[PDB]
Amino acid sequence: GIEYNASWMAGTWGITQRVDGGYKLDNSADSSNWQAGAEEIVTNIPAAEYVITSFTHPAHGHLFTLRTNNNVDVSAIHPDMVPTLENEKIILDVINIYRAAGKKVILYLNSAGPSMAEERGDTDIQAAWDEYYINEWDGDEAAAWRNLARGYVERFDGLVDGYWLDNSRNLPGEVSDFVAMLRSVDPELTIAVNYDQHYFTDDNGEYLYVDSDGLDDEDESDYKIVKHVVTNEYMDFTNGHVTPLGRGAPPNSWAYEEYTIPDMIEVPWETYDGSKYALKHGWFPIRNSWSGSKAELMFDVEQAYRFVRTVTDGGAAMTWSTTQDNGYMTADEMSIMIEISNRMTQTPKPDYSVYERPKGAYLVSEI
Numbered sequence: 001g002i003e004y005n006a007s008w009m010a011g012t013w014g015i016t017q018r019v020d021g022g023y024k025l026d027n028s029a030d031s032s033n034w035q036a037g038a039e040e041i042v043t044n045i046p047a048a049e050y051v052i053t054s055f056t057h058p059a060h061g062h063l064f065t066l067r068t069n070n071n072v073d074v075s076a077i078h079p080d081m082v083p084t085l086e087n088e089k090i091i092l093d094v095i096n097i098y099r100a101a102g103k104k105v106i107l108y109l110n111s112a113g114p115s116m117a118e119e120r121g122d123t124d125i126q127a128a129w130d131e132y133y134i135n136e137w138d139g140d141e142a143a144a145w146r147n148l149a150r151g152y153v154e155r156f157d158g159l160v161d162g163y164w165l166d167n168s169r170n171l172p173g174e175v176s177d178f179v180a181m182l183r184s185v186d187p188e189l190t191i192a193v194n195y196d197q198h199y200f201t202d203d204n205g206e207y208l209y210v211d212s213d214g215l216d217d218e219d220e221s222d223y224k225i226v227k228h229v230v231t232n233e234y235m236d237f238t239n240g241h242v243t244p245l246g247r248g249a250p251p252n253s254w255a256y257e258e259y260t261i262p263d264m265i266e267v268p269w270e271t272y273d274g275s276k277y278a279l280k281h282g283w284f285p286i287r288n289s290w291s292g293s294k295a296e297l298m299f300d301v302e303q304a305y306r307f308v309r310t311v312t313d314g315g316a317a318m319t320w321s322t323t324q325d326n327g328y329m330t331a332d333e334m335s336i337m338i339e340i341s342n343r344m345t346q347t348p349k350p351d352y353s354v355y356e357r358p359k360g361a362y363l364v365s366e367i
């Protein structure tokens with residue numbers, strides 16, 4: 001029938017606390033305290049109602065935050081795909097901290113799975129995986145990966161509320177089949193899929209392009225303006241990815257305030273198939289990086305508060321792609337989120353600074 005699985009998310013905002021996967025987690029765990037990091041987020045950011053954390057390592061579908069798998073011994077494919085037993089408890093501990101605090105949990109999962117190991121330089125893992133699905137699944141990589149992912153999905157069952165599926169153009173097999181696996185475990189999961197970005201066009205089909213962000217922008221590269229669309233029958237919320245950072249689009253682009261966010265709140269729910277409805281959701285990097293804590297901090301309180309208010313007032317949702325520094329939210333971001341949360345829990349909520357086009361910011365079409 002008709003489904004609004006993300007109805008709980010409408011009018012809410014979230015933060016991100018990624019956990020490392022596989023051998024990367026074994027390398028970072030000795031200097032990290034993700035559990036303390038999660039307690040600090042709970043204490044300091046009560047206004048955020050959910051968190052995105054990690055099934056796979058960021059941009060590395062072959063590296064998992066859990067080890068044990070009742071469906072396949074992943075450690076026997078290649079040990080570097082999975083962390084130690086001691087370290088697999090980090091993700092579970094973080095999730096339980098958020099559950100006790102009443103925060104919903106969405107897990108980032110890079111859809112490519114082990115198929116992308118060589119893309120990140122992990123050639124030994126790639127060879128082991130390729131040998132595994134060839135010999136054990138008679139060359140059916142799609143079934144091999146669904147089986148493997150299912151064994152972790154089952155462990156997270158009832159502990160998490162949704163999934164954010166990255167890199168779905170590179171999923172072995174079909175998205176429909178992978179989402180069906182997820183829903184076979186828990187059909188109420190709130191699921192986003194990142195296929196490709198869509199962009200604002202004019203009445204004759206040309207893309208809109210930002211020409212400048214301000215007076216003497218350091219990066220003059222023209223960039224397109226992301227539009228969040230409901231493009232398939234599987235999704236419960238739009239993935240929310242900004243215009244790619246590599247194209248020189250700042251994650252706090254003024255154009256997101258003139259186009260992207262207004263469009264999110266103009267029509268906060270849309271349907272592709274006529275039965276399942278999906279919620280408009282944006283995922284904004286707070287730095288000039290999705291996951292890199294050392295990148296330039298791009299938002300300040302006043303702009304970040306206006307992003308949260310404009311989205312949530314409209315009945316849409318947004319997540320900050322905050323970063324982790326030894327398991328804690330990077331401290332400059334934490335400082336901002338404290339202030340945002342404190343404003344968002346006041347009644348009345350304090351007014352946000354009104355949006356004005358930055359001096360010397362223009363579209364190519366406006367010149």
Ligand SMILES: [Ca+2]
Nearest residue numbers: 222223224247
């Ligand atoms: Ca572009």
